[PDB]
Amino acid sequence: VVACFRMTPLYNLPTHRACNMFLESYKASWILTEDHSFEDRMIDDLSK
Amino acid sequence: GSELESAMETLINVFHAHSGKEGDKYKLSKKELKDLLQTELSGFLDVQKDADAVDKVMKELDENGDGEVDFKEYVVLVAALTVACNNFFWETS
Amino acid sequence: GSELESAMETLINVFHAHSGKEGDKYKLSKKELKDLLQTELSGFLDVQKDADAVDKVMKELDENGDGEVDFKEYVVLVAALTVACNNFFWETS
Ligand SMILES: [Ca+2]
Ligand SMILES: [Ca+2]
Ligand SMILES: [Ca+2]
Ligand SMILES: [Ca+2]
């Protein structure tokens, strides 16, 4: 029971700190995972 | 009348006595708290197996980050343990 | 020790007494809470003498706003204050 009495809740955290970590998490997962393949297009367009 | 005062003063006697013998006379250090709990509860505590569990529980219980358990923090935790014991009573069936 | 266990037992006893005194299941109405308070802590505590304090304490205890108090809320806060009183007594007064 004491293992959980701490409970370290996220919902109580101040908004600005939570937003600052949310940007980090979003960048880490979503944007980073997103895959864009533009190298072929860019090289072809430059070569033309 | 003053029965809650009696319970509270008994609490004070016990945890201060368990603090003084082992370390700083008043507060609750890690070793103080470990031996204290050993003295306090038997047949119910699961912390007996590892003193490192006592250490980490102390670390959390010291959100103030001083390594010493404040009296208010300790009493609120043992109130949560009263909560757990009442839940035990209801779970009994 | 088992004495501290009995201290929690005394808390539970006093709680369930006034939880059923007015029949509020297991939860302290405003009236049960008031009578409880001036019963357990005669002296340092005031409910009849401080009715505005009783009302503010009704709001504070009932952060949920239910107006009734279960075990967790008062055990936490009342234990904290009632034990911290003597800690201040030793420290300065
Ligand atoms: Ca100490
Ligand atoms: Ca602390
Ligand atoms: Ca009740
Ligand atoms: Ca309430």
Curated annotation (Swiss-Prot), chain A:
Record protein name field: Ryanodine receptor 1
The UniProt function text for this chain reads:
Cytosolic calcium-activated calcium channel that mediates the release of Ca(2+) from the sarcoplasmic reticulum into the cytosol and thereby plays a key role in triggering muscle contraction following depolarization of T-tubules. Repeated very high-level exercise increases the open probability of the channel and leads to Ca(2+) leaking into the cytoplasm. Can also mediate the release of Ca(2+) from intracellular stores in neurons, and may thereby promote prolonged Ca(2+) signaling in the brain. Required for normal embryonic development of muscle fibers and skeletal muscle.
Modification S-nitrosocysteine, positions: 4
Q: How does it assemble?
A: Homotetramer. Can also form heterotetramers with RYR2. Identified in a complex composed of RYR1, PDE4D, PKA, FKBP1A and protein phosphatase 1 (PP1). Repeated very high-level exercise decreases interaction with PDE4D and protein phosphatase 1 (PP1). Interacts with CALM; CALM with bound calcium inhibits the RYR1 channel activity. Interacts with S100A1. Interacts with FKBP1A; this stabilizes the closed conformation of the channel. Interacts with CACNA1S; interaction with CACNA1S is important for activation of the RYR1 channel. Interacts with CACNB1.
Knockout consequences: Perinatal lethality, due to severe defects in skeletal muscle development. Neonates do not breathe and do not move. Mutant mice show defects in muscle fiber development. Their muscles do not show a contractile response to electrical stimulation. In addition, mice display abnormal curvature of the spine, thin limbs, and an abnormal rib cage.
* Section of the entire sequence shown: 3633 to 3680 of 5035
Where does the UniProt annotation place the signal sequence? none
Tissues in which the UniProt entry reports expression = Detected in muscle and myotubes (at protein level). Ubiquitous. Detected in diaphragm, skeletal muscle, esophagus, spleen, submaxillary gland, adrenal gland, cerebellum, brain and in testis germ cells.
Instruction: Give the family per the record.
Output: Belongs to the ryanodine receptor (TC 1.A.3.1) family. RYR1 subfamily.
Q: What is known of its domains?
A: The calcium release channel activity resides in the C-terminal region while the remaining part of the protein constitutes the 'foot' structure spanning the junctional gap between the sarcoplasmic reticulum (SR) and the T-tubule. Pore opening is mediated via the cytoplasmic calcium-binding domains that mediate a small rotation of the channel-forming transmembrane regions that then leads to channel opening.
What does the UniProt entry say about where the protein is found? Sarcoplasmic reticulum membrane
- Report what the Swiss-Prot or TrEMBL entry states about this protein's PTMs: Channel activity is modulated by phosphorylation. Activated by reversible S-nitrosylation. Repeated very high-level exercise increases S-nitrosylation.
